Amino acid sequence: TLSILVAHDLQRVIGFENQLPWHLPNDLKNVKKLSTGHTLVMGRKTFESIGKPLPNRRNVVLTSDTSFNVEGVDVIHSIEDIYQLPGHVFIFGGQTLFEEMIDKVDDMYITVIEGKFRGDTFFPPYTFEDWEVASSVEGKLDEKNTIPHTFLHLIRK
Numbered sequence: 001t002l003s004i005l006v007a008h009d010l011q012r013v014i015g016f017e018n019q020l021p022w023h024l025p026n027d028l029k030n031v032k033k034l035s036t037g038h039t040l041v042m043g044r045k046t047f048e049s050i051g052k053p054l055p056n057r058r059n060v061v062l063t064s065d066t067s068f069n070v071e072g073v074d075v076i077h078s079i080e081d082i083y084q085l086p087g088h089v090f091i092f093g094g095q096t097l098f099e100e101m102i103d104k105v106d107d108m109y110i111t112v113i114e115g116k117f118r119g120d121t122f123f124p125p126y127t128f129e130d131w132e133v134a135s136s137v138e139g140k141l142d143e144k145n146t147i148p149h150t151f152l153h154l155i156r157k
């Protein structure tokens with residue numbers, strides 16, 4: 001299975017100055033639940049913004065840099081390389097990779113952040129006419145999670 005995994009706001013913002021614009025532990029927990037034991041594929045800028053591979057899953061970084069060789073990270077140099085990765089593969093970001101892969105993936109796990117943030121990077125436009133809502137779950141608001149958010153699982157029609 002090839003999936004997108006993304007959190008975006010009401011205007012599809014996903015980032016600002018190499019960081020996530022919001023702070024939502026519930027979503028981090030969901031990312032961990034979905035991707036532990038599987039594979040994350042991310043562009044070079046997303047990886048660098050994270051800074052280190054995420055524990056307990058395969059980390060794959062897409063880059064043109066032939067010198068890239070980070071411990072605990074597998075490197076690929078082409079989009080076509082993604083299709084040779086075994087198991088459940090999640091396209092993890094950022095804008096460039098989402099743009100390159102949204103027409104190719106089987107399904108999408110999208111956390112919709114119900115707010116409008118300042119952003120400089122965006123998820124590409126998509127239409128529910130192309131995507132079935134397999135599930136939609138409202139996130140719980142509390143002390144640590146204070147922006148409304150909804151977990152979607154969308155499957156390509």
Ligand SMILES: NC(=O)c1ccc[n+]([C@@H]2O[C@H](COP(=O)([O-])OP(=O)(O)OC[C@H]3O[C@@H](n4cnc5c(N)ncnc54)[C@H](OP(=O)(O)O)[C@@H]3O)[C@@H](O)[C@H]2O)c1
Nearest residue numbers: 006007014015019043044045046063064093094095096097
């Ligand atoms: N909210 C979310 O769910 C979410 C998730 C992830 C990231 N983000 C945000 O997204 C932003 C970063 O996105 P971005 O678009 O700037 O960067 P990016 O997609 O993370 O990285 C782009 C880089 O990936 C490499 N790359 C992409 N396509 C390639 C290809 N076909 N062949 C070889 N290399 C390729 C290139 O690396 P080289 O230049 O080294 O060749 C390119 O410069 C950040 O703000 C981050 O916070 C948000």
Ligand SMILES: CCc1nc(N)nc(N)c1C#CCc1cc(-c2ccc(C(=O)O)cc2)ccc1OC
Nearest residue numbers: 005006007018019020028031032049050092093111
């Ligand atoms: C966790 C945010 C997020 N949610 C969803 N649903 N899909 C995504 N693709 C990303 C993402 C991303 C990139 C990113 C992840 C993280 C991050 C932080 C913590 C954990 C974790 O606790 O496991 C995982 C990723 C940090 C910074 C960062 O870019 C700045």
